[PDB]
C-alpha cells in the first residue's frame with residue numbers, strides 16, 4: 001500500500017531541494033549566506049496541492065517532483081515531521097473567500113490545521129499574523145511579514161527553525177577567533193574546535209570537495225560540502241552538484257563511518273526570509289498569480305495567492321546534548337582531519353527518512 | 366677517527382650523569398645539564414692527571430686508553446649554539462706547571478686563573494667573572510666557597526641556539542599537561558604543521574620526537590606513549606645501547622609536517638658536581654688526587670666543582686613558518702607533549718649530546 005512512498009517522496013525531496021537551492025541562489029546576491037527548508041516548503045506546497053485541480057495540480061506535481069497520483073504523500077509527509085524543528089505553516093484567507101468543507105476535513109485529517117481567516121481591515125491582519133507566527137514559533141521568528149497586499153485573498157506562510165543540537169557538545173573555552181577565507185582576503189571569525197569530534201567524512205572527485213557529516217540530536221545530521229583546495233570556488237561546486245551526484249553523496253555517507261577526528265568549523269548562524277512567489281516564478285510556476293485552479297480548496301472562480309512567505313532560522317553553536325568523551329586531552333587512537341575554513345554548502349539531513357530538512361550555504365559569519 | 370670514538374663515549378657518559386643527577390635531585394623535578402661541557406671540563410683536568418686519577422677519569426668519561434687526540438677532538442666539537450664557560454681556578458699558594466699552562470692554552474684556549482687573597486673577595490670575583498663571560502645569563506654561579514680553597518673547577522653554560530622554524534606566539538594558549546595525577550594548565554606552543562622527525566620505541570614504550578634547531582642541533586624528546594606509563598620507569602629502561610639505536614633510527618627517520626604541541630621549555634639547573642662524581646664512584650677529587658701534570662704540589666684536592674645549565678626554548682625561531690600552516694597539508698601526523706618527558710639537545714654533525722634533562726612541571 002504505502003511505505004513505497006517514503007522512498008519515492010525521499011527522492012522527490014532531494015530533487016526539489018536542489019531546484020530551490022539554485023532558485024534561492026539566483027534571487028539572492030552573489031556571496032551571501034543562505035538557509036531554507038525544502039521539507040517545510042514542500043509540505044506547505046503539498047497542502048495546497050491537496051485542493052488543486054486540472055493544471056495547477058499537474059504543475060505543482062511537476063515542481064515538487066512527485067509522480068502522478070501520489071495520493072499517499074499527505075500521510076507520508078506528516079509521518080516525516082521531525083521534532084528537531086519547530087515548523088509552522090498556515091494557509092490564511094480573507095472573509096470574502098469561502099473554503100470548501102471537504103478540504104477543511106482533509107486539511108484537519110492530514111495537516112492537522114486548517115485555513116485561518118483574516119480580520120476585516122488589511123492593517124489589522126499584519127499584527128494578527130506576526131503575533132500568530134511569534135506565538136507558535138516561541139518568538140524565534142517574530143516578524144514574518146513587514147507588509148501585506150491590500151486586496152489579499154489567499155496568503156501562504158511558513159516559518160521554521162532548528163531546535164535540534166549537536167549530539168556531542170563543543171567546549172566554548174576552545175573557540176578562538178581563527179581564520180576563514182572570505183573572498184580572496186582572510187578574515188577572523190569565531191571558530192569551534194575539538195581535537196576529537198566524531199565525524200563521518202570523505203572526498204568526492206566530481207565536486208572536488210570535502211564531504212563532512214556531523215551528528216545531531218533527533219536522528220538529524222549536518223552534512224558539510226567544502227571545496228578541497230582554495231583553488232576551487234563555491235559557485236562552480238554548486239553548478240556541479242547534480243541530484244544524481246547528491247544522492248550518491250548520501251548513499252556513500254550511509255556506509256561511511258563516524259570516527260574521532262580533528263575538527264574546526266565556524267559558528268553557523270543563518271536566518272533567511274524569502275518571498276517565495278519570486279522563487280515559484282524562478283522555477284517556472286506562475287499559477288499562483290494567474291490560471292490558478294484550486295477547485296478542491298474553494299469554489300470561488302477568481303482566485304490568486306496574494307502572498308507566500310518563507311522563513312528559516314538556523315543556529316548551530318557549541319551547545320550539544322552529551323559532553324565530549326575522554327576530555328579530548330590528546331588525539332590518541334585517531335589520525336583524521338576535517339577543517340571548515342572557506343565558504344561551504346550544507347544540508348541538515350534526516351537520517352531516518354533520508355531527505356533534506358534544511359539546505360543552504362555560508363560565505364561569511 | 367676519534368670523532369666516532371669520542372661520540373660513543375659522550376653518550377655513555379651522558380646517561381651516567383643523567384641517572385646520577387636524577388638521584389641527587391628530588392623525585393618529580395625539572396632538570397637540565399650539559400654532558401659535553403662537563404666532559405670537556407673533566408677532560409681539561411685529565412690532561413694533567415697521572416697514574417690513578419688519569420685511569421679513573423678515563424673510566425668515568427668512557428674514554429679508552431691513550432686517547433690523546435681527545436683534547437683536539439673536543440675543541441673541534443664545540444658548537445656556536447651554546448655559550449660555554451669553564452675555568453679551573455686555583456689559590457696563590459698553589460703553583461701551576463708551565464708545561465700544563467701551554468697545553469691548556471694550545472688546546473682549551475684558556476688557562477687556570479688565580480684567586481685573590483681573602484676567601485670573601487673570591488666569591489664576588491668568580492660570580493662577576495662568570496656573569497661577564499656568560500653575558501649575564503648565569504650571574505650567580507656560586508653562593509659559597511670553602512675557606513681553605515685550593516682548586517675550584519667551574520662550568521656555566523647556556524643554549525643560545527633556537528628553533529629552525531618559528532612558532533606563532535599568537536598560537537600559544539594555556540592548555541593542559543598531566544602533572545602528578547592531577548591536570549595543570551601551562552603555556553603550550555602549537556603548530557598545525559611543524560617539521561618533526563618521529564616514531565615509537567617499544568623498549569621504552571615511548572614517543573620519540575626530534576625537532577630541528579639552528580647550528581645543526583636538534584631537540585630529541587622522549588615522552589611515554591600512554592599516561593599509564595610513568596617517566597621514572599622509562600628512565601630506568603633507557604640503556605646506552607637503547608639510546609644509541611634511538612639515534613641511528615632518528616638519522617634515517619625523516620622530518621615531516623606534523624601537528625605539534627609542546628610546552629615552553631625553561632630549565633635552569635645548578636649542581637655541586639662533587640656529589641655527582643662521588644655518586645658515579647669517583648672519589649679522587651677529595652683524596653688520592655694525582656694531578657702531577659697540573660702541578661708539582663703533593664697535597665692536592667678539588668675544593669669545589671660547580672655546574673650550571675640554563676636552557677630556554679620558547680617560540681622564537683630563525684625562519685618564519687612555511688605555507689602559513691593555515692590547514693594541515695598532506696597527512697595528519699601528530700606529536701603532542703602533554704605529560705612529563707625526557708629530552709636531549711643533540712649535535713647532529715658530531716653525534717653526541719650537548720644537553721640532557723627532563724621536564725615534570727613548566
Ligand SMILES: O=[SH]([O-])([O-])O[C@@H]1[C@@H](O)[C@H](O[C@@H]2O[C@H](CO)[C@@H](O)[C@H](O)[C@H]2O)[C@@H](CO)O[C@@H]1O
Pocket residue numbers: 173550
Ligand atoms: O577554564 S579557565 O582555566 O580557561 O576559565 C576561567 C578562569 O580564567 C578562572 O580562573 C582564574 O581565576 C582568576 C580569578 O581569581 C582570574 O584572574 C583568571 O580568569 C584565572 O586565572 C576561573 C575562576 O572563576 O573562571 C573561569 O573558569
Ligand SMILES: *[C@@H]1O[C@H](CO)[C@@H](O)[C@H](O)[C@H]1NC(C)=O
Pocket residue numbers: 102105106109
Ligand atoms: C474526512 O476525510 C477523510 C479523507 O480525507 C475521509 O476518510 C472521511 O470520510 C472524511 N469525512 C468527512 C465527514 O468529510
Ligand SMILES: *[C@@H]1O[C@H](CO)[C@@H](O)[C@H](O)[C@H]1NC(C)=O
Pocket residue numbers: 463464467468471
Ligand atoms: C706548547 O704546547 C705544544 C703542545 O702541548 C708543544 O708542541 C710545545 O712544545 C709547547 N711549548 C712550550 C714552550 O711549552
Ligand SMILES: OC[C@H]1O[C@H](O)[C@H](O)[C@@H](O)[C@@H]1O
Pocket residue numbers: 535
Ligand atoms: O595579530 C595581532 C593583532 O590582532 C588583532 O587585530 C588586534 O586588534 C591587534 O591589536 C593585534 O596586534
